[PDB]
Amino acid sequence: MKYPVEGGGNQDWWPNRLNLKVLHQNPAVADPMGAAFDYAAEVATIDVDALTRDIEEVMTTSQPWWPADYGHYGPLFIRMAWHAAGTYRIHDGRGGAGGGMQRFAPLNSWPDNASLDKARRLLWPVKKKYGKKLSWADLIVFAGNCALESMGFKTFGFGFGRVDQWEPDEVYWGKEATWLGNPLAAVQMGLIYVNPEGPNGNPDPMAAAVDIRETFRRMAMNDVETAALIVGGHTFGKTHGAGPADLVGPEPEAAPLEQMGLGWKSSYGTGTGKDAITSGIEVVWTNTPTKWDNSFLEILYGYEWELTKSPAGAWQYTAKDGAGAGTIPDPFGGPGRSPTMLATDLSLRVDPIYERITRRWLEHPEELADEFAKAWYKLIHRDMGPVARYLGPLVPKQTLLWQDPVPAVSHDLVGEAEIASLKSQIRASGLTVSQLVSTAWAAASSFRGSDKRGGANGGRIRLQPQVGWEVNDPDGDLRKVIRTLEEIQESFNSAIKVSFADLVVLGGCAAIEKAAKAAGHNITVPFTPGRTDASQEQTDVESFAVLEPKADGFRNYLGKGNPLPAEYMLLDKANLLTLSAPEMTVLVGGLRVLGANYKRLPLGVFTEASESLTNDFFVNLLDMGITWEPSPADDGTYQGKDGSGKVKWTGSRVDLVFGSNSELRALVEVYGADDAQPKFVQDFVAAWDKVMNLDRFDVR
Amino acid sequence: MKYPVEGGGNQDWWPNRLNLKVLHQNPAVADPMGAAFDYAAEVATIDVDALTRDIEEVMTTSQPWWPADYGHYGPLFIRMAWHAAGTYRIHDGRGGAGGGMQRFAPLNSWPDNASLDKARRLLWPVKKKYGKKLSWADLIVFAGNCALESMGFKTFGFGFGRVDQWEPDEVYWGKEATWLLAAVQMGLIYVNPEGPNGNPDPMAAAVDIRETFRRMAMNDVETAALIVGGHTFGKTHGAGPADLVGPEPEAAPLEQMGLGWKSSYGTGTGKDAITSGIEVVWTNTPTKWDNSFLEILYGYEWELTKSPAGAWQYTAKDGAGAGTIPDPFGGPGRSPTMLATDLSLRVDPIYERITRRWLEHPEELADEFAKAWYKLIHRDMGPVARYLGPLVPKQTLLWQDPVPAVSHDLVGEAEIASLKSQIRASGLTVSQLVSTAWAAASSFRGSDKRGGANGGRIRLQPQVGWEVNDPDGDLRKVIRTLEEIQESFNSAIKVSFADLVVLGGCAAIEKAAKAAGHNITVPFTPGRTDASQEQTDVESFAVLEPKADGFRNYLGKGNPLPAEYMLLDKANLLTLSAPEMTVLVGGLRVLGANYKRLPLGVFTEASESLTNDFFVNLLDMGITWEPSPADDGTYQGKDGSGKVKWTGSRVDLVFGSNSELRALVEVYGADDAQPKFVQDFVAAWDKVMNLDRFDVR
Numbered sequence A: 001m002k003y004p005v006e007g008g009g010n011q012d013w014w015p016n017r018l019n020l021k022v023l024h025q026n027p028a029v030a031d032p033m034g035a036a037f038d039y040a041a042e043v044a045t046i047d048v049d050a051l052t053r054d055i056e057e058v059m060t061t062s063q064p065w066w067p068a069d070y071g072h073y074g075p076l077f078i079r080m081a082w083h084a085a086g087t088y089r090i091h092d093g094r095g096g097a098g099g100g101m102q103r104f105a106p107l108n109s110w111p112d113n114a115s116l117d118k119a120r121r122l123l124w125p126v127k128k129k130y131g132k133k134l135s136w137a138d139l140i141v142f143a144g145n146c147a148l149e150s151m152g153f154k155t156f157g158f159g160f161g162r163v164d165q166w167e168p169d170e171v172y173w174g175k176e177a178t179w180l181g182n183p184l185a186a187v188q189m190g191l192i193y194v195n196p197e198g199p200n201g202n203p204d205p206m207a208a209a210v211d212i213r214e215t216f217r218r219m220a221m222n223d224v225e226t227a228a229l230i231v232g233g234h235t236f237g238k239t240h241g242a243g244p245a246d247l248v249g250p251e252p253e254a255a256p257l258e259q260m261g262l263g264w265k266s267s268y269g270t271g272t273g274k275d276a277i278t279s280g281i282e283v284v285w286t287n288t289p290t291k292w293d294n295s296f297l298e299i300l301y302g303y304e305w306e307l308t309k310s311p312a313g314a315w316q317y318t319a320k321d322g323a324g325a326g327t328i329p330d331p332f333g334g335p336g337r338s339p340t341m342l343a344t345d346l347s348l349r350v351d352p353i354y355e356r357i358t359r360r361w362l363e364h365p366e367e368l369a370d371e372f373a374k375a376w377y378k379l380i381h382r383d384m385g386p387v388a389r390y391l392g393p394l395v396p397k398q399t400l401l402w403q404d405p406v407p408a409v410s411h412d413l414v415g416e417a418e419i420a421s422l423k424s425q426i427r428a429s430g431l432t433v434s435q436l437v438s439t440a441w442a443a444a445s446s447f448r449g450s451d452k453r454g455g456a457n458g459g460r461i462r463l464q465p466q467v468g469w470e471v472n473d474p475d476g477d478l479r480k481v482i483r484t485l486e487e488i489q490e491s492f493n494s495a496i497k498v499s500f501a502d503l504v505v506l507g508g509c510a511a512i513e514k515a516a517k518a519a520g521h522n523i524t525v526p527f528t529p530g531r532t533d534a535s536q537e538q539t540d541v542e543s544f545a546v547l548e549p550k551a552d553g554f555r556n557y558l559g560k561g562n563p564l565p566a567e568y569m570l571l572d573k574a575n576l577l578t579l580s581a582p583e584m585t586v587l588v589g590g591l592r593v594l595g596a597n598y599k600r601l602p603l604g605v606f607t608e609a610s611e612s613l614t615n616d617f618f619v620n621l622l623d624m625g626i627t628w629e630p631s632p633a634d635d636g637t638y639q640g641k642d643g644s645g646k647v648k649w650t651g652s653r654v655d656l657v658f659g660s661n662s663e664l665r666a667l668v669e670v671y672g673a674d675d676a677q678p679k680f681v682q683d684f685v686a687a688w689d690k691v692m693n694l695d696r697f698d699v700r
Numbered sequence B: 001m002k003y004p005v006e007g008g009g010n011q012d013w014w015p016n017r018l019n020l021k022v023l024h025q026n027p028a029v030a031d032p033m034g035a036a037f038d039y040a041a042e043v044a045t046i047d048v049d050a051l052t053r054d055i056e057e058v059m060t061t062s063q064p065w066w067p068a069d070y071g072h073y074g075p076l077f078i079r080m081a082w083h084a085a086g087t088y089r090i091h092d093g094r095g096g097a098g099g100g101m102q103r104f105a106p107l108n109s110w111p112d113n114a115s116l117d118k119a120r121r122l123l124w125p126v127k128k129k130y131g132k133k134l135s136w137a138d139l140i141v142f143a144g145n146c147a148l149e150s151m152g153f154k155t156f157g158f159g160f161g162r163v164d165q166w167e168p169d170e171v172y173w174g175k176e177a178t179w180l181l182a183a184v185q186m187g188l189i190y191v192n193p194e195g196p197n198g199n200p201d202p203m204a205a206a207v208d209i210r211e212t213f214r215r216m217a218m219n220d221v222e223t224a225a226l227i228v229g230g231h232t233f234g235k236t237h238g239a240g241p242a243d244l245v246g247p248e249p250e251a252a253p254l255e256q257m258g259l260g261w262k263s264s265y266g267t268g269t270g271k272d273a274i275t276s277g278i279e280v281v282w283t284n285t286p287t288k289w290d291n292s293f294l295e296i297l298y299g300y301e302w303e304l305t306k307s308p309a310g311a312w313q314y315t316a317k318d319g320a321g322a323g324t325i326p327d328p329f330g331g332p333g334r335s336p337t338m339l340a341t342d343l344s345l346r347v348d349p350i351y352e353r354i355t356r357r358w359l360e361h362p363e364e365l366a367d368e369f370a371k372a373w374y375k376l377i378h379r380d381m382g383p384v385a386r387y388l389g390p391l392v393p394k395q396t397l398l399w400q401d402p403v404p405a406v407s408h409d410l411v412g413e414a415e416i417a418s419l420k421s422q423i424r425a426s427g428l429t430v431s432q433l434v435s436t437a438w439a440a441a442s443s444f445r446g447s448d449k450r451g452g453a454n455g456g457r458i459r460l461q462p463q464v465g466w467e468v469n470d471p472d473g474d475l476r477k478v479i480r481t482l483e484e485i486q487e488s489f490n491s492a493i494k495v496s497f498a499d500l501v502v503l504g505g506c507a508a509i510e511k512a513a514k515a516a517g518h519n520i521t522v523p524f525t526p527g528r529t530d531a532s533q534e535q536t537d538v539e540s541f542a543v544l545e546p547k548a549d550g551f552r553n554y555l556g557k558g559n560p561l562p563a564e565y566m567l568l569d570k571a572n573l574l575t576l577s578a579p580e581m582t583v584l585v586g587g588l589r590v591l592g593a594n595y596k597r598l599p600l601g602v603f604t605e606a607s608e609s610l611t612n613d614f615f616v617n618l619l620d621m622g623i624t625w626e627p628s629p630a631d632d633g634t635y636q637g638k639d640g641s642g643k644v645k646w647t648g649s650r651v652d653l654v655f656g657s658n659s660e661l662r663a664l665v666e667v668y669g670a671d672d673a674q675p676k677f678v679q680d681f682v683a684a685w686d687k688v689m690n691l692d693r694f695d696v697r
């Protein structure tokens, strides 16, 4: 229907086709830094003092193509930071500022990130003067933070380490196929949090409060943070509004080329500064919108508000009787204005929940500072991962209970001879292979490569938020495996201290070695030590209530509330784990033949003899002498009807896909060859070593 | 609108968004074999003597879930190769057999490749026995070529080498959004069998076939070789009206394991399957070679009747031939039948002569069909240095872009410096050397690997006269100076011509780098030869003429899109990637490599000096842009005070507009990256100049 370079390919002929482009996004070819570049080794060598001494400079020179309000840019950079790490939705994990996606995406065109392309273009001198030693995400967010600092503040700190990706990330943002139309977080399509004029353009404070709380909750922010975040943020800078909001041009994706990749080039007046239009509201919040103080709340409790319209054609509030008419300084010189407020932010005065936590902030005006610093530092470094990546000399030392704190190694890391000793001690009185893998896999499947939260490290697999997960059948034998592993741990220690997660991954390794040896290959899985155990008080039970996978194909289990059919979720779960197209298929075959099945069902297994790591899943799948017909009980299962009329195999919806979707058919059509056995077991161990070492960030 | 794993973003909100996901396609991540796996090295060990002894067996055994007419699959295989090497489009170069795209693509769902999805399954007991030492594409077109030989025929040869791919390539097949360029009806690989556009008249079928095949290099005499030589084998499954067939494979319920067209009529297979909806049985012995097709084609006079499937097919009048055709599964014989496209060869005046001439002695038909089939198969492989295996018919050909054998003593870099010296110590300027070299290595298409810098065709008639290489400019001067150097060098180990072309290009890059302060050594691998004017035909090169070489900022007439896209579609052929594309475009813009001396695009104040000044001067926001008052697709870089300082084109400012490429320009446009930029430019350049060097890699 249209050319490929414009769109094209397939998907113009099929609406819902299993698109295999999401597995290998962000390839190593489109990386202009090269194939041997380590960002963690470079970003530590910048002189953050010199950088801090430079961003402070770019925040004072009013560039002539976009004038500076009050001769300072700080507000704009804080807004940039907030709209850069305000997309992080915990329901799946994708988004956030961990990829700096605000540059190129549907993000750099949402009808709220308007007048933000100019904000990024402002920072070009600093990135130009530094080069490859400053990834764009780090520059944006740290510029916001250093602005907040420069405008009079004492921040909690900051840490570099976010890496850039050079291709847009595909994330589901909303069913509404038009701007302003459960896995979501922005109540509109294109909004970040809330329609500034109240939900659905309706300026009601109560609905605004309900909605703003129901939105922030999908980003793990409490009730005290939300109030702190909003207040501390909007105590800075002004709005942008002039004539009718319909005069703005197109967005920086359908804009003409002479605009150098900008947008919203307003034709009204000179087009910038005193007449620039962006959100269609015209409000100044404080009375000195360029430096910090406890004044926004005073205005929040200083005048009684009544609704009005906007000179730009929008809804807002304004003090009655002309109170304070002409008391707030002009953004570019001129007579005073009237103290105004947005629609939502009045909720902080009427809503009874926020009232108890805002009325306290009139007196004790200092507590606002620390709470805002904490909430901000939480909003920033939310998608960086464990503590071991906070590079640079500005990170604090104290840990926070949301960081998933993992205590540092306080003993000698185990040795190699001890590794073989533990192998022998675990494969002689441990348990079957189908158990030592299932528990091990479950300890490394809570990972999410979106924000690198959770995983094998910490050993949380034996604590409350994960043992009770129904996906790891609690009334099964997982607790018995836990008892055995802890007792062999303490026995070897009584016989250099080995932690628990170390031993879990070692059990998985020894089980895979057992299966491979049963298959006829003396192969070894590479194991590196360097994990520690977490305690119940350092792992929040409620925070981890989202990692519980609603659909996990690699163990063949689907739950309830599943958005898409039970097949696509396999790739989705295989996309967070950052698995290439081959490493997903081989891993599926391995887990299927190894008996890593939820409740030990006879689904997925395609072998007459289990616990033997062979390619018997694939060779037996592609056989055409069997006919597949949906099950008679109609439970989303199928039946391997043979040529004799006897049911032979019984796979699930996540299996027969690996023999149907003509693309994924190819990868199987390799590992199922006659001489593929010396390759399968060798390509499998690689993928298994890759999964079990995703959260190993202290050494990689 | 929909989830990413099923549909995606970045497309619904804006349809006309420059999609860079077409550059990184076929990456190094989705490769099961992993990293290296030199396919050109593995297949050198397979026993074609044994592979033939196995495909011969898989054909004679009738599978129980798809019987074989007359107990032989030879037919269904012969077609499979054809529809696997019939997706060639000469006007672009994509498709072809060398992509193995017969599997995962819209290709395996077109309402023409029906029932063929079964054939890919009949071959599994063959590939399973070999695995990685024999890719699909080679196997598909071999089972094609190897079914002919096993059926009373001495073909011309065969060669492996078509390394497969692991993701569906992106190709434009047409504008219609419904089934039924090069194909005449969307989905139908070639001609709608029931006459062009459903009109059952042979005279129109002939004028359609002529133009259609003319889009795939086949002449007028190599056409009748195929059709007559291709439809001597096998029948056409079409019993029963084409109304009960299942859905297409890409959208079928999974209990079919990716097989499409689950026919509910009758038993569903065998003597009752449905493929295209025509019941026709050509020869009287449809599983061996003989001069039978032409015999029946002239044996009677024809008349149009209806089909048991509801299509228009023909049948001899007079009621003769009652039962003269063997029943495909034992029983009463049908009447002598025929398609609609075949009658063209009886009524069209052009094919009439050759058809009449093939009936006096059919050995000429055998030979012509042999050569035509060989051309139909080994077209998507290009240089003769890629053919592997024993069965290569290494004698010669004329359409293979032939080059003489590397005969003289090569060079051992002891004099390469002197050549790189005399090319500046007795030659021209950098703004001409890089221009002519890049021109001589721009006639390349990583699809079928035709053209290329090899052969030294930059001094021959088909390429010297192209418009994009302005002949009135100075190309002749550069070529004559290079010739004088070559002749002055061999009198004292002889060096060819394209040798000196790319060597002067590299030495000019070195000169420009010295003019910047980075004494960088360009790599160079000798071993290319110059072809003559006779072995370089003119008719097959008229397509390689670039219609929009965005690298050089040249826009011809005949672009379906603006210039901003015709750069990618160009930079997608050369097997480039976004970093290399940006770097190479910047280098060619700053080194003065436009098809004139135009200052259009140059963003420097001291040319002929390789540097990143283009990138850094592009991004400065203090410079505003607006369309020039000439309204000739040129923008006017207006400075802040009202003066003209830069003049760019659509191919330039796209790097300032499109957000993805903006990141790359940001990277190379720093200040501690000029060494990185010049080094990566040298690397990408040596990648371009060494695309067709297949005799070494």
Ligand code: HEM
Pocket (backbone or CB within 6 Å): A075, A076, A078, A079, A082, A115, A193, A194, A195, A196, A229, A230, A232, A233, A234, A236, A237, A238, A239, A240, A241, A277, A278, A279, A280, A281, A342, A344
């Ligand atoms: C949570 C609800 C929020 C709403 C409804 C909201 C809405 C808005 C609106 C309508 C504007 C004016 C846009 C324009 O002038 O074009 C704005 C700007 C701004 N926002 Fe937000 N925002 C929210 C959250 C935040 C947060 C979390 C922060 C900081 C942590 C923040 C900091 C700012 C600042 C400093 C500006 C001033 C921009 C300038 O001076 O140019 N806002 N916000």
Ligand code: HEM
Pocket (backbone or CB within 6 Å): B075, B076, B077, B078, B079, B082, B115, B190, B191, B192, B193, B209, B226, B227, B229, B230, B231, B233, B234, B235, B236, B237, B238, B275, B276, B278, B341
């Ligand atoms: C204008 C060119 C062509 C037309 C109109 C045409 C038409 C057709 C049609 C409609 C079928 C029915 C498919 C089926 O029943 O499975 C068919 C089958 C077949 N075609 Fe073609 N085709 C063309 C080119 C070729 C070429 C170039 C070859 C060989 C080099 C070829 C060889 C065959 C064979 C052997 C079959 C029988 C397959 C079987 O019996 O399993 N055709 N042709």
